[PDB]
Amino acid sequence: PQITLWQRPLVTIKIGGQLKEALLDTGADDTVLEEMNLPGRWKPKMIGGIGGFIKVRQYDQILIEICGHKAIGTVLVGPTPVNIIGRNLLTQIGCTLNF
């Protein structure tokens, strides 16, 4: 689809068997999801944004379905205020900015 930006660009995702909403976020390098139950091993990581840093769990080779498009990649899980789909997954579903 084409998405204008008069509202937040929220989409439905399926990850770890669960349905969630997430923001398509071109300003995010990585994908960061609110605390949730994912299986398997992970590695600690710290990421920074406008107000400081947060500690997240890094999961690799995670399957995520984003508005009906499948992608596999790294997902960070931790105390983000909003679920974010970052460029690591936006590139895999073919997402572009246009003006």
Ligand X SMILES: CC(C)CN(C[C@@H](O)[C@H](Cc1ccc(F)cc1)NC(=O)O[C@H]1[C@H]2CO[C@H]3OC[C@@H]1[C@H]3C2)S(=O)(=O)c1ccc2nc(NC3CC3)sc2c1
Could you say whether residue 81 binds ligand X (CB under 6 A)?
A: yes
Give the residues lining the site for its own copies (CB under 8 A): 1-6, 8-9, 23-29, 32, 47-54, 67, 69, 80-82, 84, 87, 90-91, 93-99
How many other CB atoms sit within 10 Å of the CB of residue 3? Answer: 12
**What b-and-e string marks burial along 61-93, b requiring 16 or more CB atoms within 10 Å of the CB?**
ebebebbeeebebebbbbebeebbbbebbbeeb
Query: Cα(81)–Cα(88) distance, rounded to whole angstroms?
Result: 19
15 makes contact, choosing from its own copies, ligand X, none, with CB < 5 to 8 Å by partner type, with none
In the complex, least distance from residue 97 CB atom to ligand X, rounded to whole angstroms = 13
Site for ligand X in 16-75 (CB under 6 A): 25, 27-30, 32, 47-50
